[PDB]
Amino acid sequence: GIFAFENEQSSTVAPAKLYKALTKDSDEIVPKVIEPIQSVEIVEGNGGPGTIKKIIAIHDGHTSFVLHKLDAIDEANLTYNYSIIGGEGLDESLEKISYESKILPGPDGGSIGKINVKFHTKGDVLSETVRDQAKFKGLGLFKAIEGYVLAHPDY
Template identity: 25%
Template sequence: MASTNSWTHEIESPAAAPRLFRASVMDWHTLAPKLVPQIVASAHVVEGEGGVGSVRQFNFTSAMPFNLMKERLEFLDADKCECKSTLIEGGGISAAIETATSHIKVEWAANGGSVVKVESTYNLLPGVEVQDEITKAKGYVTAIFKAIEAYLIANPDAYNDQLNQSTEIIYMINM
C-alpha cells in the first residue's frame, strides 16, 4: 500500500498574478525550453488544445533524475489563476511514485506582485522515501518561477493581454 504525502511551497514575485500564471502554467510548454534549457530540452502538448484534459510532455536534460514527464490538466480557472494537474508518465511514476498531483494558485500580493502557492500530493511506492527529492523539487519550482519572473521583467509587454480592467478591479477588491 502506498503512503500519501504532500508538500507546499510559496514563492513571492513582483510580477502581476495573471501574467505570471499565463506564462508559468498556460504557456510553460512553450517557454520552458527557452528559459531553462539546462533543465527542459523540449516540451509540447501531446493531447488536447491546452484546456482541461490536455496532456503536455516535458523532455529533460541530464540535469534531472528522469528524462520525461507527462502531465494531464485536471482543473483550470484562468480568471482565478489556478490549476491542478496529474502526473501520468515519467517523473518517477512506477519507480518511486504511484500517483502525483500538483495544485498551483497564483494570487495577487498587496504590493501589486503575486504569491505562487504550490501543493504537491503524491503516493509513494512501498519502501520509498523522498526527503532529499522534496528539497530538490522545491528548488526546481523556485528556479522555474524565478526564470519566468525574470523573463516577464525583461519583457514588460509579454502576457499583458490578461491584465484588463476586470483583473484590476479584482485586485482592488482583494486589497
C-alpha cells in the first residue's frame, strides 16, 4: 500500500540557511540535538544521490539504526528527496518511507518547509500509531535542527 501525506511548517530562519542545516550540516547537527542518536555514517556512496547512511541510535538500552537513502537533491531550488529504507528503526510493517521536501520563502525573511511523505506499507493498512510515530520522529528532527540554528545562528 501507499499512503501519502503533506505537511507544512513555517520558520523564521531564512530559506537558504534552513536548507543548509537540514541538508549539508544535518549529519553534524543531528547527534547534537537528538540525544539518542549517536552518529551518522555513510555506508554506500560518496555523499551524492544514491548515498546510503546508517543513523545509529540507542533504543531500549541497546544500539539500533535506520538506513537513509538520498534520492535526489537540487540545491538551487532548495529541494531534497530521501527515503528511510530499512534497519530496526523502520517499522516492520513498512517497506520504506519516502520524502520529497522543499524550502520556500516565507514572510518577514523566513521560510516555509513543505514535505510530501509516502508510507509504503507491506500490507494494505497503515497503523495510526506507526504513522504518528514516524511523523513525530521526522517533525522532531526538523524542529530540533531549526531550534539549533535559532539558538546558534553563527554555528
